Coordinates of C-alpha atoms in Angstrom, one line a residue:
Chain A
X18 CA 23.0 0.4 7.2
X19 CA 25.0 -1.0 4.6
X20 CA 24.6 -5.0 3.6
X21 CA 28.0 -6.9 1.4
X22 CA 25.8 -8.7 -1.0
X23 CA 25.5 -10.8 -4.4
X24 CA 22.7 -11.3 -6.6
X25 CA 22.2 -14.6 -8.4
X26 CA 20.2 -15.7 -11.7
X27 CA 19.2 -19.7 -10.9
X28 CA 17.0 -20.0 -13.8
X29 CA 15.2 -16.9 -12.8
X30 CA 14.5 -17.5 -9.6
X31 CA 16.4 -14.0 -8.1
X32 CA 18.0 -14.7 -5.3
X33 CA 20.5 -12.0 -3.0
X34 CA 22.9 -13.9 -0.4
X35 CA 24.0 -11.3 2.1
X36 CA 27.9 -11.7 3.2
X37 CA 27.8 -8.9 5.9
X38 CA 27.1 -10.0 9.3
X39 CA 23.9 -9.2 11.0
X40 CA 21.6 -10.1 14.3
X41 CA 19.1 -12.9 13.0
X42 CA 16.3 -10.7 14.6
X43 CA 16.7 -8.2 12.1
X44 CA 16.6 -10.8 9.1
X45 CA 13.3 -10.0 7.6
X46 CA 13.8 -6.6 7.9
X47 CA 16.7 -6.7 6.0
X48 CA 15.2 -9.6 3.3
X49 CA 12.1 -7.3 3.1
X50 CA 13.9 -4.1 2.0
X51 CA 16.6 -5.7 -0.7
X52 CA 13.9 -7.9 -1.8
X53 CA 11.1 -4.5 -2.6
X54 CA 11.6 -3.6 -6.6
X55 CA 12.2 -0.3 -5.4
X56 CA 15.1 -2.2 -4.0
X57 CA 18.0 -4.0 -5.3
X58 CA 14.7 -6.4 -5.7
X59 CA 15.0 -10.1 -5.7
X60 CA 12.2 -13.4 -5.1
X61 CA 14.4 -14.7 -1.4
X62 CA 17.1 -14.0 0.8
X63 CA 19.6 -15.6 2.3
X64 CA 22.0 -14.6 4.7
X65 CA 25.4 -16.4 4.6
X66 CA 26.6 -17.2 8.4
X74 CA 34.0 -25.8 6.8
X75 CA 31.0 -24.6 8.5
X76 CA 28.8 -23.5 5.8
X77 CA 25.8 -22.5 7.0
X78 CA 22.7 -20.6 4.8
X79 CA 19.9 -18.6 6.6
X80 CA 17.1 -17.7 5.0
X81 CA 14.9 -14.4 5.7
X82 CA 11.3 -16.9 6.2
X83 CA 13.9 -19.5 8.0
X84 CA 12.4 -21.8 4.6
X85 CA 14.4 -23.8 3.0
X86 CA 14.9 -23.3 -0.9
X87 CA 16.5 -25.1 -3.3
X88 CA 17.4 -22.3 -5.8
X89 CA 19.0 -20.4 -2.5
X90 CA 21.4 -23.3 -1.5
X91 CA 22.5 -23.7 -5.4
X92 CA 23.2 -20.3 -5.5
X93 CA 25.5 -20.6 -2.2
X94 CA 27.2 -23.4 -3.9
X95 CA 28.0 -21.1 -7.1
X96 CA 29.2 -18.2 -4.1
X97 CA 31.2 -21.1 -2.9
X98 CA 32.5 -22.4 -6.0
X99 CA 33.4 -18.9 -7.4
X100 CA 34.5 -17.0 -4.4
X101 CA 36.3 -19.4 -1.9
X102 CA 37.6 -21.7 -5.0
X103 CA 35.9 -25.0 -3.7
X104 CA 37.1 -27.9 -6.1
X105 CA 34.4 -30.2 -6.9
X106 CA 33.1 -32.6 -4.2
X107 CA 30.3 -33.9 -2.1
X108 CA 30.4 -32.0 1.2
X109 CA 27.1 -30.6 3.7
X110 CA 25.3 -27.7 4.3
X111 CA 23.3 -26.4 7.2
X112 CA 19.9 -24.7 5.8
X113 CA 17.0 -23.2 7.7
X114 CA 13.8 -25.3 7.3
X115 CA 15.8 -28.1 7.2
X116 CA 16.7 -30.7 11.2
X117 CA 19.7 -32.3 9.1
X118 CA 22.4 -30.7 7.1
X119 CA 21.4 -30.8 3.3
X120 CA 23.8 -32.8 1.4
X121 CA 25.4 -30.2 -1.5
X122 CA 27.8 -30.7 -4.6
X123 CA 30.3 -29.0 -7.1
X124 CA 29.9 -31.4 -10.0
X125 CA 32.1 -30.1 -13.6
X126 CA 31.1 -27.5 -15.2
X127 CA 29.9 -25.3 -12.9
X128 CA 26.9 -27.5 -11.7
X129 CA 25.6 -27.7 -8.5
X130 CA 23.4 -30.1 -6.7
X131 CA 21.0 -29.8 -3.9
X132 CA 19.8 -32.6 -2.1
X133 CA 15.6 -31.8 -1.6
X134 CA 12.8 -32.7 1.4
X135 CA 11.6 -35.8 1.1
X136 CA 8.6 -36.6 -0.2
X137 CA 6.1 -38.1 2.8
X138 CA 3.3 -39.7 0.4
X139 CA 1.8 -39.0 -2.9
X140 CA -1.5 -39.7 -4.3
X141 CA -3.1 -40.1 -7.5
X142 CA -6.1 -38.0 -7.8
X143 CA -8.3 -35.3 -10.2
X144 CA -8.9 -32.0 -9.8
X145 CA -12.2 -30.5 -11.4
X146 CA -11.2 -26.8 -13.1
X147 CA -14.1 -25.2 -15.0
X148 CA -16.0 -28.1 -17.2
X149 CA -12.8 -30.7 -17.0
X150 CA -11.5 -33.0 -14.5
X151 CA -7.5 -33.4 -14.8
X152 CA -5.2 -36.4 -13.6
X153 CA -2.7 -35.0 -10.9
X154 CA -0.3 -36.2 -8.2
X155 CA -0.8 -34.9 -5.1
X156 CA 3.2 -34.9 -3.8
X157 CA 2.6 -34.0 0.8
X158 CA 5.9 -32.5 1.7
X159 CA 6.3 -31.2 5.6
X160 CA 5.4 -27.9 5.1
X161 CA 4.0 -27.6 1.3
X162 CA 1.9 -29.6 -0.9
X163 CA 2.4 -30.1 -4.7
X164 CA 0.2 -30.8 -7.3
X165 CA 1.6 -32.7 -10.5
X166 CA -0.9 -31.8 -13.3
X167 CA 0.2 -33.1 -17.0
X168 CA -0.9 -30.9 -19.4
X169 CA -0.4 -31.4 -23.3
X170 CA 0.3 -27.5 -23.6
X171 CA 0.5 -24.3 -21.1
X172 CA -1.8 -21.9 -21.9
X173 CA -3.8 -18.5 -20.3
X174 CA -6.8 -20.2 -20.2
X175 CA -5.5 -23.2 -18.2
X176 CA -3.4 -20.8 -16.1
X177 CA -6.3 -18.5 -15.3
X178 CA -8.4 -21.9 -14.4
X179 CA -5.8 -22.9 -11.9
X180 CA -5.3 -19.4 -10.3
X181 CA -9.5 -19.7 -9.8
X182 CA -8.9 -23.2 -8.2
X183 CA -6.3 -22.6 -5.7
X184 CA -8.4 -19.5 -4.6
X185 CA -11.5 -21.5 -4.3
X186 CA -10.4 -24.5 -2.0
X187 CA -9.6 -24.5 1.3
X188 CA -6.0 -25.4 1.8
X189 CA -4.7 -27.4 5.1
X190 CA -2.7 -24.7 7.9
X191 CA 0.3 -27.6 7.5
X192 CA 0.8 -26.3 3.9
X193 CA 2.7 -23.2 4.3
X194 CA 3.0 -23.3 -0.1
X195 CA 0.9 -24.9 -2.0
X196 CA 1.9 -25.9 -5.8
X197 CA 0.2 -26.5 -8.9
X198 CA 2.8 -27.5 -11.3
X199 CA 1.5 -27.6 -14.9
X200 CA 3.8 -30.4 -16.8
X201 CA 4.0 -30.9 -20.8
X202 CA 5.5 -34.0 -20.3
X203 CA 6.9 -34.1 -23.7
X204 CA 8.5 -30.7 -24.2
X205 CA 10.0 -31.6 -20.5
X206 CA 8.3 -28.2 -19.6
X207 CA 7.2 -26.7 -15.9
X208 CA 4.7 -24.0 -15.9
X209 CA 4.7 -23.7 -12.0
X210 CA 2.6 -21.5 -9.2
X211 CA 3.4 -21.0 -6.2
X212 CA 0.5 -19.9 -3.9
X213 CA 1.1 -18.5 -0.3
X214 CA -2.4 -19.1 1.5
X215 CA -1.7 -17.4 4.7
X216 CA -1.3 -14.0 2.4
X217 CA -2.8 -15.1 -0.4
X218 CA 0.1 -14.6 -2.8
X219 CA -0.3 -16.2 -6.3
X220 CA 2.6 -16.3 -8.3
X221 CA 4.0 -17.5 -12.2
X222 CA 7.4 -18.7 -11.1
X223 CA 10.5 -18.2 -13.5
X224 CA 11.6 -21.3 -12.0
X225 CA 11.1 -23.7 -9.0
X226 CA 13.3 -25.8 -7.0
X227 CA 11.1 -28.0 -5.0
X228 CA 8.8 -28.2 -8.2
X229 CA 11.6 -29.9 -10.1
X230 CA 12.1 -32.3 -7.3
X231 CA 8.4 -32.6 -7.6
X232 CA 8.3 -33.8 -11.4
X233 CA 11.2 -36.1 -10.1
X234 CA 8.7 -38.0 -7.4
X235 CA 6.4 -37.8 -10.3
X236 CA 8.9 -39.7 -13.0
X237 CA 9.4 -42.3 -9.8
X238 CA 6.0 -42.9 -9.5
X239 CA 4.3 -43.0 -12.9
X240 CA 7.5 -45.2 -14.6
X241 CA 8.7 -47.2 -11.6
X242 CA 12.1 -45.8 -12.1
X243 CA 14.8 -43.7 -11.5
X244 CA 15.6 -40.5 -13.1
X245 CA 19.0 -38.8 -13.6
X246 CA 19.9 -35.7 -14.5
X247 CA 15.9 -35.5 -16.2
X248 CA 15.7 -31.9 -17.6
X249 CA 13.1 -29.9 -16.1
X250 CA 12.5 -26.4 -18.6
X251 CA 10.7 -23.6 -17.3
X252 CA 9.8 -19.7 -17.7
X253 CA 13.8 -18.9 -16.2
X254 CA 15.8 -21.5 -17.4
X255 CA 16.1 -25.7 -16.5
X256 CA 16.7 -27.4 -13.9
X257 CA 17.6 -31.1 -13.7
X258 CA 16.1 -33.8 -11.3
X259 CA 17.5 -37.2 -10.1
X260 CA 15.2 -39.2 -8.3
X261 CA 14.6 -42.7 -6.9
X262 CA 12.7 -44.6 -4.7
X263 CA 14.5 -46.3 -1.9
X264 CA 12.8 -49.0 0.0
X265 CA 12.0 -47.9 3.2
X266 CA 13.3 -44.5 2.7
X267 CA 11.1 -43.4 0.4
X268 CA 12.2 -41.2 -2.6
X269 CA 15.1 -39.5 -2.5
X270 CA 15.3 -36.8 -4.5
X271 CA 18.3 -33.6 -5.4
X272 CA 18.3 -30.9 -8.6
X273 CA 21.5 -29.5 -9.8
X274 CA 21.7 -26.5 -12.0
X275 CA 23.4 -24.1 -13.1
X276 CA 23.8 -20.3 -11.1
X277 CA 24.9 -16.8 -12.9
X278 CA 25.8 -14.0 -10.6
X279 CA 24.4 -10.6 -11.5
X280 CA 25.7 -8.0 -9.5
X281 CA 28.3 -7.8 -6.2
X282 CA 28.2 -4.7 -4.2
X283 CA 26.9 -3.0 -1.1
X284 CA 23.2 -2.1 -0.4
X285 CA 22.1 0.3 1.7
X286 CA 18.8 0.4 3.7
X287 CA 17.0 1.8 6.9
Chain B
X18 CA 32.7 -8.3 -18.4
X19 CA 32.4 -6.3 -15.2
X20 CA 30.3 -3.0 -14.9
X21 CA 30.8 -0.5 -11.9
X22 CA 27.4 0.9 -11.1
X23 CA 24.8 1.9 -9.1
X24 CA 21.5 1.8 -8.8
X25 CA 18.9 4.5 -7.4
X26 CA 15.7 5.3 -6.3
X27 CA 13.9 8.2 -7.9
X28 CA 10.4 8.1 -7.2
X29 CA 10.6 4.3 -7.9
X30 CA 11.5 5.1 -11.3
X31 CA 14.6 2.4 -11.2
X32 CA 17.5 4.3 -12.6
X33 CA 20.9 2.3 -13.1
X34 CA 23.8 4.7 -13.0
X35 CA 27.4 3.2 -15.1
X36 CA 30.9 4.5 -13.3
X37 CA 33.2 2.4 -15.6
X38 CA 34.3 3.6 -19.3
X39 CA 32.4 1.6 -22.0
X40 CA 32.9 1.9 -26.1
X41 CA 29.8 4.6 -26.6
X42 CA 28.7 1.5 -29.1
X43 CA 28.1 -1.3 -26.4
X44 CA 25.8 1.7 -24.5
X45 CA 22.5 -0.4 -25.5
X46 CA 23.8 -4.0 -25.3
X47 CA 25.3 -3.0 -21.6
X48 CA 21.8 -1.6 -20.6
X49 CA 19.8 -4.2 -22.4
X50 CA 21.8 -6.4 -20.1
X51 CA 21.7 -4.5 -16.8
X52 CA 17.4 -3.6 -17.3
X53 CA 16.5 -7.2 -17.5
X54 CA 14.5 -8.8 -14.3
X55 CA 16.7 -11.5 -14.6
X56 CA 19.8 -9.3 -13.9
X57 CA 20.3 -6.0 -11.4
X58 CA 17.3 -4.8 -13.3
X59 CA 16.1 -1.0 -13.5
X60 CA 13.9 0.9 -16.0
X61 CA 17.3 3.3 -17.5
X62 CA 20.7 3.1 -17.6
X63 CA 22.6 6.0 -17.9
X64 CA 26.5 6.3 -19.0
X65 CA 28.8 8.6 -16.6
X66 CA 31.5 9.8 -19.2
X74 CA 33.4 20.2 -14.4
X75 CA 33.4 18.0 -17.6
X76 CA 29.9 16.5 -16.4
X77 CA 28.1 14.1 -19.3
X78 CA 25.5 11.7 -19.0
X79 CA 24.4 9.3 -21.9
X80 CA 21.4 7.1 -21.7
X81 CA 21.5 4.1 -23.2
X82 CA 18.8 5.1 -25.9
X83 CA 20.2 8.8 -26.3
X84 CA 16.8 10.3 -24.8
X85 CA 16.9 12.6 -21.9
X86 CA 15.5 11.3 -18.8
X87 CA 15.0 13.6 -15.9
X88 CA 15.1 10.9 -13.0
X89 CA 18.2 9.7 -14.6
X90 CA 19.5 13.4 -14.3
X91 CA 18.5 13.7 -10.7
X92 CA 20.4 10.7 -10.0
X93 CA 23.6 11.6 -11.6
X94 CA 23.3 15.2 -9.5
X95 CA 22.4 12.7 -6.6
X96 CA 26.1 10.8 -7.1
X97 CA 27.4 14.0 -7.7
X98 CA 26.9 15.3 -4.4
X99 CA 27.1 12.0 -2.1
X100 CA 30.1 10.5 -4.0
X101 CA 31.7 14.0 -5.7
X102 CA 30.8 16.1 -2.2
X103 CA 29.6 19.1 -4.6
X104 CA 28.2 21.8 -2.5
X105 CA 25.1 23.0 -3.2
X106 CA 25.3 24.9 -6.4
X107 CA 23.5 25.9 -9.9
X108 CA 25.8 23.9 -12.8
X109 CA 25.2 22.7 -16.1
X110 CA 25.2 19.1 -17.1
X111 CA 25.4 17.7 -20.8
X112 CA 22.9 14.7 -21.4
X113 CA 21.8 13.0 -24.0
X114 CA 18.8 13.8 -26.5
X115 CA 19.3 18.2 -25.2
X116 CA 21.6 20.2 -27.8
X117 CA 22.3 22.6 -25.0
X118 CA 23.7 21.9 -21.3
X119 CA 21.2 21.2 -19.5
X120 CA 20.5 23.6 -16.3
X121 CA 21.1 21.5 -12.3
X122 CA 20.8 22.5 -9.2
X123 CA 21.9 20.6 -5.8
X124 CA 20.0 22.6 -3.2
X125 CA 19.6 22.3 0.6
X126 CA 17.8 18.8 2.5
X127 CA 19.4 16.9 -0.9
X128 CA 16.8 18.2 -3.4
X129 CA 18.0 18.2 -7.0
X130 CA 16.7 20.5 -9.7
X131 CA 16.4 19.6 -13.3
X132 CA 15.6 21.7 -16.1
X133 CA 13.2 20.3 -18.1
X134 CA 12.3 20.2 -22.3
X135 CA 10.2 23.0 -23.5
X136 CA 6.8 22.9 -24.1
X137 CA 6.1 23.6 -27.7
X138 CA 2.9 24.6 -27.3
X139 CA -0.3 23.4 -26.1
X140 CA -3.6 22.6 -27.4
X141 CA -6.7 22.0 -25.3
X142 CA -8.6 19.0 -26.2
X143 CA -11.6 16.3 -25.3
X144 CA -10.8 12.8 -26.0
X145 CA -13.6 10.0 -26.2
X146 CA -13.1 6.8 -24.2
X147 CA -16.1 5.2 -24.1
X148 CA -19.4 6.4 -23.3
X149 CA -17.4 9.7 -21.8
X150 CA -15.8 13.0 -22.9
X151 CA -12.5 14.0 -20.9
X152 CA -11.2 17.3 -21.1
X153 CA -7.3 17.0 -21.6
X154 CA -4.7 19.3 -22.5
X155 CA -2.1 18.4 -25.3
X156 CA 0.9 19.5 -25.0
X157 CA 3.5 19.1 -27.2
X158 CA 7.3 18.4 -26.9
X159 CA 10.0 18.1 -29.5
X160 CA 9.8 14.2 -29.2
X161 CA 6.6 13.1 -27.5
X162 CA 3.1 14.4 -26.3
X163 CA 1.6 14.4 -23.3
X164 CA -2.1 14.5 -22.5
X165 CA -2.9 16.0 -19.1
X166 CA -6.4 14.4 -18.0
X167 CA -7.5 15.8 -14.7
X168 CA -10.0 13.2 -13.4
X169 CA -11.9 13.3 -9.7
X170 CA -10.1 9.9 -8.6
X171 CA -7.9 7.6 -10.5
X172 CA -9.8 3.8 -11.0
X173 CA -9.0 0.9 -12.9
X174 CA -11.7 1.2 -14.8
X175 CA -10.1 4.3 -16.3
X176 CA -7.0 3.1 -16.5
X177 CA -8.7 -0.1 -18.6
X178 CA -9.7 2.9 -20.9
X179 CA -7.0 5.2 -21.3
X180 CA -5.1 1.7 -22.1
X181 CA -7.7 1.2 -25.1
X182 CA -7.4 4.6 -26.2
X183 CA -3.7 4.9 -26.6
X184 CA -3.6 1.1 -28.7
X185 CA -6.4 2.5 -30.8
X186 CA -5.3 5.5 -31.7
X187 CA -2.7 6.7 -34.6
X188 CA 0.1 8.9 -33.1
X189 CA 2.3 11.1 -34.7
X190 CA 5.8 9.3 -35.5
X191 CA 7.3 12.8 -34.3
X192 CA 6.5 11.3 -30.8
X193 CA 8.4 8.6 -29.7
X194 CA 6.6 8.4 -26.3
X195 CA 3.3 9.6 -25.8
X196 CA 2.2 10.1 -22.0
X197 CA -1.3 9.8 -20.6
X198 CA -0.9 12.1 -17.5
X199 CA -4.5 11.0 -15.2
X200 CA -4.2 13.9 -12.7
X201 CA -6.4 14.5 -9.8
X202 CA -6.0 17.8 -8.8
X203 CA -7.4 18.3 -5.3
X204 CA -4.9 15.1 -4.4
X205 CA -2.0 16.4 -6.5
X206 CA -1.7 13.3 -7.4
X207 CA -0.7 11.7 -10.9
X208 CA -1.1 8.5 -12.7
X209 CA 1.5 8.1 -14.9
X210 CA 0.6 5.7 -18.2
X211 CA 3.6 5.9 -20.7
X212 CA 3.2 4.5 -24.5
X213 CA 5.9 4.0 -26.8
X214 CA 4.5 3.1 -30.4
X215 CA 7.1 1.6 -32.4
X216 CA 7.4 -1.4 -29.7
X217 CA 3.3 -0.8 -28.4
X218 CA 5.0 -0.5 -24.9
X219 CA 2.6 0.2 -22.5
X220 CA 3.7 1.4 -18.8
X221 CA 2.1 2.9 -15.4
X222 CA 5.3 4.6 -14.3
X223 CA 6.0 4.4 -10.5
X224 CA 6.6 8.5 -11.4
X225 CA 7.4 10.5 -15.1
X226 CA 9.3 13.5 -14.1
X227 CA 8.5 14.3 -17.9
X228 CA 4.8 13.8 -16.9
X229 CA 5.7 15.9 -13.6
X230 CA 6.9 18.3 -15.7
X231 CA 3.7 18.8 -17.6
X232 CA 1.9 19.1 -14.9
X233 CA 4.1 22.4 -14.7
X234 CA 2.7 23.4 -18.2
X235 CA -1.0 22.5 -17.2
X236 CA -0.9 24.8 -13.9
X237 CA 0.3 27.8 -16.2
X238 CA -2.3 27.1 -18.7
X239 CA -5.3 26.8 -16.4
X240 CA -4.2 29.5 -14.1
X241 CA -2.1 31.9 -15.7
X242 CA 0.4 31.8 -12.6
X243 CA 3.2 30.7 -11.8
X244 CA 4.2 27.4 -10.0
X245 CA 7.0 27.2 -7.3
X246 CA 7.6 24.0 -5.8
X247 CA 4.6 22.3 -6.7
X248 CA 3.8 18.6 -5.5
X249 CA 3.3 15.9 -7.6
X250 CA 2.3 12.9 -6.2
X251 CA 2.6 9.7 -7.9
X252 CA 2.9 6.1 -6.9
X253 CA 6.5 5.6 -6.5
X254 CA 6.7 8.5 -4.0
X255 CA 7.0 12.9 -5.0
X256 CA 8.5 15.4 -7.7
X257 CA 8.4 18.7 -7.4
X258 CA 7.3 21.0 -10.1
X259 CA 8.6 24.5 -11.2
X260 CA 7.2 26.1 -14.3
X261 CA 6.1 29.8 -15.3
X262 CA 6.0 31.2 -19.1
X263 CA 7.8 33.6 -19.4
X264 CA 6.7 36.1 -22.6
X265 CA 8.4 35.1 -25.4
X266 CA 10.9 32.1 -24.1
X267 CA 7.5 30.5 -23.4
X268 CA 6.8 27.8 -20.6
X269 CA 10.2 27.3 -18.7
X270 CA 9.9 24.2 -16.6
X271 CA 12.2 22.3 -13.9
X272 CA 11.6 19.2 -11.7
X273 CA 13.2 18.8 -7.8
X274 CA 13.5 15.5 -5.7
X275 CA 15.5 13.2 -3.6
X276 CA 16.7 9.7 -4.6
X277 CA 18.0 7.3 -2.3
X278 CA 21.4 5.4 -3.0
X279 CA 20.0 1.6 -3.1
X280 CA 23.6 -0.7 -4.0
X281 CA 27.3 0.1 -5.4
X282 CA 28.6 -2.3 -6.6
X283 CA 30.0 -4.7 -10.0
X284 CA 27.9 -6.2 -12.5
X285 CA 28.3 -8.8 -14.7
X286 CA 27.6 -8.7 -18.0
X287 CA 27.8 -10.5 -21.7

């Protein structure tokens, strides 16, 4: 079976969009075989169906994923820049996308329900956090004055040790130097108990963006997020009733165009 | 700057495979490129230049890399089945290929020197090993009743403690558990204190060749060596005066075809 594909770099975060049509029952099939490293290997797939419309292989919705169908969008069908909107799995409304100069796109995020200041006891410390309650995921904000293997190797041992709620299908800790504007983030997977380092992380960017909102009662535009892959930027705001409202932009290399072959 | 390539599946030794003519100068920038996680990513690059030549990227001869060129050969080329030379990289003579029946490639293999057998001391334990020894790197055969992490923990400290031989630019710890045919591949490089468990070594394979003439004093024909990425087959007899004579025989898949993008 041959799949049209690309492979993208968004700050590390691997991502293949498939071109090539398929049957949606055979998604994660397909997303499971490119995505092996005995594969063309990758972190997510989408598969590409005015009518722009993204599919990932979970049905999730990821920010890095949408960029990178922005840069496909961009660079193959010669979109100018504008404001225009996408349909997404994971997501009841279309997500509101842009082509901004320079090759930068932007990704409107989910919205944040509630946070909640709190602490989180690792080893012989207790450490300041915000607890950010998403739909489906949950992020903790944990400032940090440096990243290192012994705080990493404390969280990995705290996310395994707690009992996470069934409506958390991710949960986050996202270790933030605050002033090096860095993002040390994990990404654990309770149902399969998947810890991983991230290169980079969309929704965690939007998460330090809710963060900025809340601890400085202000907006934040274009904030630079660094991490392991690359940066990501962050505008955010609290609106009212609506709550924050959030987007990243970034920039999106592609790798490789070709044809893979599984089965 | 575009790169035609492909990328293959030997044993889940990742081999990247270049189509498009390149200045024999940008050979390790191009791969350096191309082996990154952050790009297609693989673990070689080989250079396509009856004229058949392969060039890795480092100038070493790698037999997965060969068995995927004789792979391209036949799916992309149609070659019959048929005994051929091949010039490669790091062998001053042609180097003997076969494409037999079912898609099995044959590769002949570097002499073995000459072998020594040996204990080495890892812990509180003695491990009888055979050395053998190969115009540019060693490799210790360590047959062992199961493969653990424990003595993989060890075999790591050994190689970082010891001094090796600048003659060797890789030196291969080859944990081999004979009933199982299988083989744990741990590959060192000391100038950059590189440390790997190959998915397979069809070097390594290759030794195993040597060690069943050694211990045996027979010939082996198709031998089975199982590693973690998937099988190699193993040919290897001495033969008076010419001394051990060696090949190696698998499939690789075809994963993608495709362009790459590069500088």
């Amino acid at each position: 079976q041959v799949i049209e594909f690309s492979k993208y770099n968004p700050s590390g975060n691997m991502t293949i969009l498939v071109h090539s049509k398929h049957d949606a029952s055979e998604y994660a099939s397909i997303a499971n075989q490119l995505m092996a490293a005995t594969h063309v290997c990758c972190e997510q797939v989408g598969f590409i169906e005015n009518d722009f419309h993204l599919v990932m292989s979970g049905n999730e919705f990821s920010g890095n994923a949408t960029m990178s169908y922005i840069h496909h969008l961009q660079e193959s069908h010669l979109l100018k820049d504008q404001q225009f909107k996408v349909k997404v799995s994971g997501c009841s409304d279309l997500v509101q996308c842009a082509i901004h100069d320079c090759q930068y796109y932007e990704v409107q995020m989910p919205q944040a329900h509630r946070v909640v200041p709190t602490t989180i006891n690792m080893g012989n410390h207790s450490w300041k956090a915000l607890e950010i309650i998403y739909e489906t995921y949950v992020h903790y904000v944990i400032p940090v004055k440096q990243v290192t293997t012994e705080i990493q190797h404390l969280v990995e041992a705290f996310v395994r040790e707690q009992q996470w709620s069934h409506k958390y299908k991710t949960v986050g800790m996202m270790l933030f130097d605050e002033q090096r504007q860095f993002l040390q983030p994990l990404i654990y997977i309770p149902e399969i108990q998947s810890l991983i380092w991230e290169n980079s992380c969309g929704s965690g960017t939007a998460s330090i963006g809710v963060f900025n909102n809340y601890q400085r009662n202000d907006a934040c535009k274009d904030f630079t997020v660094h991490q392991p892959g690359g940066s990501i930027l962050v505008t955010s705001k609290r609106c009212h009733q609506l709550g924050y409202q959030t987007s990243i932009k970034g920039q999106v290399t592609t790798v490789a165009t070709g044809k893979a072959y599984i089965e």
